[PDB]
Design an enzyme around this catalytic site. Structure first.
Site, mmCIF file in Angstrom:
data_model
loop_
_atom_site.group_PDB
_atom_site.id
_atom_site.type_symbol
_atom_site.label_atom_id
_atom_site.label_comp_id
_atom_site.label_asym_id
_atom_site.label_seq_id
_atom_site.Cartn_x
_atom_site.Cartn_y
_atom_site.Cartn_z
ATOM 1 N N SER A 45 33.441 45.385 47.743
ATOM 2 C CA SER A 45 32.804 44.096 48.025
ATOM 3 C C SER A 45 32.785 43.718 49.507
ATOM 4 O O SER A 45 32.214 42.693 49.876
ATOM 5 C CB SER A 45 33.473 42.978 47.221
ATOM 6 O OG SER A 45 32.933 42.891 45.914
ATOM 7 N N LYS A 48 29.429 42.949 51.336
ATOM 8 C CA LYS A 48 28.730 41.684 51.150
ATOM 9 C C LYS A 48 28.635 40.879 52.444
ATOM 10 O O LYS A 48 27.741 40.048 52.599
ATOM 11 C CB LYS A 48 29.399 40.867 50.041
ATOM 12 C CG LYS A 48 29.077 41.397 48.651
ATOM 13 C CD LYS A 48 30.026 40.873 47.587
ATOM 14 C CE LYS A 48 29.738 41.530 46.245
ATOM 15 N NZ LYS A 48 30.726 41.157 45.198
ATOM 16 N N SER A 105 32.672 36.496 45.895
ATOM 17 C CA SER A 105 32.391 37.893 45.598
ATOM 18 C C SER A 105 31.444 38.017 44.405
ATOM 19 O O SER A 105 31.477 39.006 43.669
ATOM 20 C CB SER A 105 33.692 38.648 45.322
ATOM 21 O OG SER A 105 33.594 39.989 45.766
ATOM 22 N N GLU A 141 25.239 46.321 42.597
ATOM 23 C CA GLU A 141 26.401 45.886 41.836
ATOM 24 C C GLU A 141 26.089 46.027 40.350
ATOM 25 O O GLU A 141 24.966 45.754 39.924
ATOM 26 C CB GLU A 141 26.753 44.436 42.168
ATOM 27 C CG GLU A 141 27.350 44.238 43.554
ATOM 28 C CD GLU A 141 28.792 44.704 43.645
ATOM 29 O OE1 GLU A 141 29.280 45.335 42.682
ATOM 30 O OE2 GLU A 141 29.439 44.440 44.680
ATOM 31 N N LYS A 209 37.167 39.035 53.928
ATOM 32 C CA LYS A 209 36.459 39.416 52.713
ATOM 33 C C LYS A 209 37.166 40.620 52.114
ATOM 34 O O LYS A 209 37.412 41.612 52.803
ATOM 35 C CB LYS A 209 35.005 39.776 53.005
ATOM 36 C CG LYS A 209 34.227 40.210 51.770
ATOM 37 C CD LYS A 209 33.914 39.024 50.871
ATOM 38 C CE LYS A 209 33.453 39.460 49.490
ATOM 39 N NZ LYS A 209 34.590 39.864 48.617
ATOM 40 N N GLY A 211 37.833 43.501 48.737
ATOM 41 C CA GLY A 211 37.105 44.349 47.805
ATOM 42 C C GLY A 211 38.102 45.023 46.889
ATOM 43 O O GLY A 211 39.277 45.141 47.230
ATOM 44 N N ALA A 212 37.646 45.455 45.721
ATOM 45 C CA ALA A 212 38.534 46.105 44.768
ATOM 46 C C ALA A 212 37.759 46.844 43.686
ATOM 47 O O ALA A 212 36.637 46.472 43.342
ATOM 48 C CB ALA A 212 39.466 45.081 44.138
#
Ligand SMILES: [Ca+2]
Length: 263
Positions: A45, A48, A105, A141, A209, A211-212
């Site tokens: 993420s 983004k 997100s 996504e 920001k 992400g995962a």
């Protein structure tokens, strides 16, 4: 207590997989410290932020307006769309979509934004056009996530992402107003609590920001500094481990504490 680089190596020893890390001075752009700076990691993420950078670039070029309202249908919703699922009737403006993509997100928000610019490949062209020939987005996504092992799709390197983020936040690629809007959204991040923010002292500025990927990967990009002003960019990527989310989060939090104590 341990030095940052030591803590980073430790984290990798504990988690398995790979950990990538870089710290750059915001002003000079000098690399202060790094680990696996030129190795590839999945962006998750964190892309983004780049996406909305391309959006603001179109705004600066007079080809887009943050106030333009976008209407969509239930057909457009993908997994994890906490904000967009609540606005099926009234829709959302481009600005709101970027806020959702970055601060929450929101996945559908990102997909809608990607459509306004022609898809993942068009975002990649934007990156190339600003001197980043490493970072690449290939999928939408949520496929762009998780995460098959070292497949170069939807990846970057610590140093590429850091350099590109510096170019967006400073320099004249975006107008002053757009630069501020970008960092404003990142400052308002609402879902990165358990990470760097958990170790930040009082009075410090942070815009980030995260992400995962269900299993294996985790990441955070951030601009932070004391006295309410960002002075450094930190990027941390992790991938290829069988560790739990709790362990991943903890290690990142510990790396963050080391960064601060040794600022
Ligand atoms: Ca190692």
């Amino acid at each position: 207590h341990p030095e940052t680089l030591v803590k980073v190596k430790d984290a990798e020893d504990q988690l398995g997989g790979r950990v990538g890390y870089i710290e750059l001075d915001l002003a000079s752009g000098k690399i202060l410290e790094s680990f696996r700076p030129e190795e590839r990691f999945p962006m998750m993420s964190t892309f983004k932020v780049l996406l909305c950078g391309a959006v603001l670039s179109r705004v600066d070029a007079g080809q887009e307006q943050l106030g333009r309202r976008i209407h969509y249908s239930q057909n457009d919703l993908v997994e994890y769309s906490p904000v967009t699922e609540k606005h099926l009737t009234d829709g959302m403006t481009v600005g709101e979509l970027c806020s959702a993509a970055i601060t929450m997100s929101d996945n559908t928000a990102a997909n809608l934004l990607l459509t306004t610019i022609g898809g993942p490949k068009e975002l990649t062209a934007f990156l190339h056009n600003m001197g980043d020939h490493v970072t690449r987005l290939d999928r939408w996504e949520p496929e762009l996530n998780e995460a098959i092992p070292n497949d170069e799709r939807d990846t970057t390197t610590p140093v590429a992402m850091a350099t590109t983020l510096r170019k967006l936040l400073t320099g004249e690629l975006l107008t002053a107003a757009s630069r501020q809007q970008l960092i404003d959204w990142m400052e308002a991040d609402k879902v990165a609590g358990p990470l760097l923010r958990s170790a930040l002292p009082a009075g410090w500025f942070i815009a980030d920001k995260s992400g995962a990927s269900e299993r294996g990967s985790r990441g955070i990009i951030a601009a932070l500094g004391p006295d309410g002003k960002p002075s450094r960019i930190v990027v941390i990527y992790m991938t290829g481990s069988q560790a739990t989310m709790d362990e991943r989060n903890r290690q990142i939090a510990e790396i963050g504490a080391s960064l601060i104590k040794h600022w």
